Design a protein around this nucleic acid. Structure first.
Lengths: 116, 100, 99, 82, 126, 11, 103, 155
RNA sequence: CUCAUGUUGCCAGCACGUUAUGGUGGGGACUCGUGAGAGACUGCCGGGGUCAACUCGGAGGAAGGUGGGGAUGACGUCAAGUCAUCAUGCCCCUUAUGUCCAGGGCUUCACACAUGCUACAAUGGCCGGUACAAAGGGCUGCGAUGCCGUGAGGUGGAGCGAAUCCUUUCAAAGCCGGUCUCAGUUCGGAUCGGGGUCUGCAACUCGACCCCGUGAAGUCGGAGUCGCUAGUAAUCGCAGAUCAGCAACGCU
């Protein structure tokens, strides 16, 4: 079905379904369904548009979205990269930030093992 | 290792016995509850005014004679090497090589 | 009845045994009630090391500072018998817990 | 981090220096050795020089730099590539 | 009365071999609520199979130590020993089967210079 | 950015 | 596999002019020439710096990977050149022998 | 064993079936100590075969084993510049064992969504004469035929 | 395996509380714990053997043929390593190569190598319910009972110098039940943005933990190569010390 921008799956229990939005994990999913009063052992196939409306209401009332989340990620990163912080310097260099290894590992942030 | 730092560890222990006994602990008793003056204490600041050697964190358990500062054993106050040698010379209470 | 519990500690079983026998003999003198040397288990403190300096960690040496233990529950505490027992001098590998 | 209940680490030396500066209501360059002090927005106009193991670096403070320690803005390691 | 013992790698269990039914008691439960494993059941019952005395002797025992397998082995050992105490003449067909040997396969001390008992680290020649 | 509220949470 | 000879130049504590590096890489290419089985060449350039020495100032350890059998050449001399060349000739003996026994 | 071999372990009989090749089977499919898991998998699969065939699964099992169990296999040797493969007869112990090894390892790479189903269908297929186990056994006989020439070595 | 043996541990025959329960009086009965001691020695039956060693089959026995594992490293080499555990012969410093201090670094990184851990899934992941282990550690230390916090933890201190109390009456893999249905997924968890907890004067460089969101590379791995013969391998978990607090997946 359609929602805040994720073309939802079909054979996925709702706890699994909601998680395919950028702003949700299983914790928030279960919490939302508890607030909504609808079971989680259902299918998008047997889903109701009124229930979709309830879902939309709760999430847009008490949670942020794709755009807000990605904008805010950019906001923190542009903040700490323009104010001259150590974290921001590492973000510029494409390097780990939390005090990790640089000598050997950290190919997840350096890219694949291009040989030198 | 060095007579200097051995002396310094001893001296820090004495400074501890002076001030970490009460004057670096009653402020923690100030700082633990919710009813503290932390709102306006500056007991944090008076603690900063106390020396750095107030704390036992700046200590280091050195071997009582040699001062091999690593490989310390608190059961003995000694380092692994002297412990070997003297257990090995049979100069300790009920200490022996073992099996199981 | 009234009870008194003595918990002995030492490193050498030979000494704990000899002292237990001498003590129970002194208890036997004044007819005071004995339970005897009820064996508790042993402690096994272990402290591994390395033999040599600067490297060779694969080589090691173990040590074990045990502590043998005995309970001797004494009953019928005649204070004359207490005056007898309190003031025996024993080998120094033993320490005692009169309670 | 320095938890709420304790309150921040705003060390007494430069606290006293800034008390002087804001009681005079004029703001000047300041030299300090304390990376470990966190920030209040009281410092926004104030200017600090901070040590890199080698020398000092005068640096000006700003609104959004609060919640941080100054050593975040003092570069410790030079690295230039290969 | 009858009272005997079995042991298999820290699996001690005492046994009261009653002349009753084949009703088993294992600290307030039975051979299928405790030990839901038919292989363990087979190990425990095989002496009864041997002497053809299933449903002739009840048991009361206490679980203590070990895990399921050690407990089962110690149990059948103790039962065999109780049967020898009831009558020796079944013995020469039991050691024939080895339902009497106290399994001397115990754990090895984890040694030094290794990761565990025998698995050394990867020996590079570099 | 919302530092006036940061140091209402922090005091 | 031609640049696959994993050069490893190194000296614990020596004044190492960077033309010694040219020497080493060239003398190791010289045996790239006649052994196409090569992965690793860990190499040292060591110095004992004792007084009133026993005629043997510098020292070298060399080891090389082949497909299975690894090679080992150790040497000793007064300076860089005899060390390089001597360990080279010992490796040459090893490798002539290895490619004679390979078939 | 430069001084000599040592005995084989005394397999138990099955509590349910009356055959020690089944305990051998669970101990060859075992992985990471989960012996009871092996047990329940095998019993479920054999009873699946029972409802597939209306009879005991043990007979079709041993029939599959008659299909996939060789008595001849290969044993290499390096000689004179070119290593030669050689036929060598196989005693029934290692015959059954290697047959079961084939059986499991070519069961694992099937697509029945579940080991119990993969295994049961493989056993049925080998009783029928279709399994990759049988295929590999035929490849082994093919090799022995291609290299009969080296039997005079008698080794 | 025998004798002795009874608390802080067993507790059958007994009695008494009966929800938390050996909980308490009571019995040394099985365990048990700690001490002493017989027992295995080709000792014995037989077959081979210079009739010698020695070995091949048997009995009993718990074990059978140096029962198993440890500890114990002949002379000596490798001018192996250690003048930084220590001590030491020589030369050098002494207004400094010494020495007291605050900051920083030893955690840098375009790469290579070596040791390991969790993964690449259905023998599986997730949720729920239920059971049995040994082992050690603990005083200006260990810490629950009740509750709040999502949970890290939070005041509180019973009770313990300790088979008593904390160590849940000591666990996890496992058993049973429900869903997921072969997939870049309910795999996998990195990396990163937030918000918090704790120890410390102090968490930026440079700490661990928690919650939220984030959800990457990776689809069993080349030449070749490491380890392992029995409770061994392979796997799950726990504990201890060094420790203020942590890189502990390491070590034992």
């Amino acid at each position: 079905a359609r929602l805040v921008g994720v073309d939802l799956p079909r054979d996925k229990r709702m706890e699994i379904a909601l998680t395919y939005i950028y702003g949700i994990g299983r914790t928030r999913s279960n919490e939302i369904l508890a607030a909504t009063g609808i079971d989680k052992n259902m299918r998008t196939k047997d889903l109701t548009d009124d229930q979709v409306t309830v879902l939309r209401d709760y999430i847009e009332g008490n949670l942020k979205v794709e755009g807000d989340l990605r904008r805010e990620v950019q906001a923190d990163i542009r903040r700490k990269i323009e104010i001259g912080c150590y974290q921001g310097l590492r973000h510029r260099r494409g390097l780990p930030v939390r005090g990790q290894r640089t000598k050997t590992n950290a190919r997840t942030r350096k890219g694949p093992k291009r040989t030198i | 290792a060095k007579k200097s730092k051995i002396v310094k560890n001893e001296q820090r222990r004495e400074l501890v016995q002076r001030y970490a006994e009460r004057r670096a602990e009653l402020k923690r008793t100030i700082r633990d509850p919710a009813s503290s003056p932390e709102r306006r204490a500056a007991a944090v600041s008076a603690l900063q005014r106390l020396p750095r050697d107030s704390s036992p964190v700046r200590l280091r358990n050195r071997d009582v004679v040699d001062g091999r500062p690593r490989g310390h054993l608190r059961k003995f106050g000694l380092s692994r090497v002297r412990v070997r040698e003297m257990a090995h010379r049979g100069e300790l209470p009920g200490v022996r090589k073992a099996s199981w | 009845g009234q009870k008194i519990r003595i918990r002995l500690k030492a490193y050498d079983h030979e000494a704990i045994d000899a002292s237990a026998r001498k003590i129970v003999e002194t208890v036997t003198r004044t007819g005071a009630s004995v339970v005897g040397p009820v064996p508790l288990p042993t402690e096994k403190n272990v402290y591994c090391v390395i033999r040599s300096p600067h490297k060779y960690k694969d080589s090691r040496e173990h040590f074990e500072m045990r502590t043998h233990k005995r309970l001797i529950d004494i009953l019928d505490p005649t204070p004359k018998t207490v005056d007898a027992l309190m003031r025996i001098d024993l080998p120094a590998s033993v320490d005692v817990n009169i309670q | 981090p320095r938890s709420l209940k304790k309150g921040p680490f705003v060390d007494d030396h430069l606290l006293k220096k800034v008390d002087v500066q804001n009681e005079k209501n004029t703001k000047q360059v300041i030299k300090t050795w304390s990376r470990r002090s966190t920030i209040i927005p009281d410092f926004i106009g104030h200017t600090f020089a901070v040590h890199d193991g080698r020398k000092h670096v005068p640096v000006f403070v700003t609104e959004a730099m609060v919640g941080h320690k100054l050593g975040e803005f003092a570069p410790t390691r030079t690295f230039k590539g290969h | 009365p009858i009272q005997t013992v079995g042991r298999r790698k820290e699996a001690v269990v005492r046994v009261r071999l009653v002349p009753g039914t084949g009703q088993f008691n294992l600290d307030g439960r039975t051979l299928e609520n405790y030990f839901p494993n038919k292989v363990h059941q087979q190990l425990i019952k095989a002496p009864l199979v041997t002497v053809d005395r299933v449903d002739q002797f009840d048991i009361y025992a206490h679980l203590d130590g070990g895990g399921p397998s050690g407990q089962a082995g110690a149990l059948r050992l103790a039962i065999a020993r109780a049967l020898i105490l009831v009558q020796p003449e079944d013995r020469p067909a039991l050691k024939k089967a080895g339902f009497l040997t106290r399994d001397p396969r115990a754990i090895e001390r984890k040694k030094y210079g290794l990761k565990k008992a025998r698995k050394a680290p990867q020996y590079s020649k570099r | 950015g919302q530092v006036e509220k940061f140091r209402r949470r922090y005091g | 596999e031609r640049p696959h000879a994993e050069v490893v130049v190194k000296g614990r504590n020596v004044e190492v002019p960077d033309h010694f590096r040219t020497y080493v890489s060239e003398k190791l290419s010289r045996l790239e020439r006649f052994d196409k089985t090569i992965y690793l060449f860990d190499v040292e350039l060591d110095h004992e710096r004792n007084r009133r020495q026993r005629k043997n100032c510098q020292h070298v350890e060399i080891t090389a990977r082949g497909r299975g059998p690894v090679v080992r050449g150790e040497a000793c001399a007064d300076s860089f050149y005899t060390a390089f060349e001597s360990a080279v000739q010992k490796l040459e003996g090893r490798l002539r022998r290895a490619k004679d026994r390979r078939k | 064993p430069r001084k000599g071999p040592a005995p084989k372990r005394p397999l138990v009989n099955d509590p349910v079936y009356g055959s020690q090749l089944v305990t051998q089977l669970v101990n060859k499919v075992l992985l990471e100590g989960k012996k009871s898991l092996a047990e329940r998998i095998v019993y479920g699969a054999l009873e699946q075969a029972r409802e597939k065939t209306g009879t005991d699964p043990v007979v079709t099992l041993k029939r599959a084993l008659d299909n996939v169990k060789p008595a001849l296999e290969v044993r290499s040797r390096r000689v004179g510049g070119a290593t030669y493969q050689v036929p060598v007869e196989v005693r029934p112990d290692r015959s059954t064992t290697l047959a079961l090894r084939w059986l499991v390892n070519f069961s694992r790479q099937r697509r029945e969504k579940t080991m119990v189903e993969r295994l049961a269908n493989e056993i049925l297929d080998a009783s029928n004469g279709l399994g990759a186990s049988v295929k590999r056994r035929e490849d082994t006989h093919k090799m022995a035929e291609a290299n009969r020439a080296f039997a005079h070595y008698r080794w």
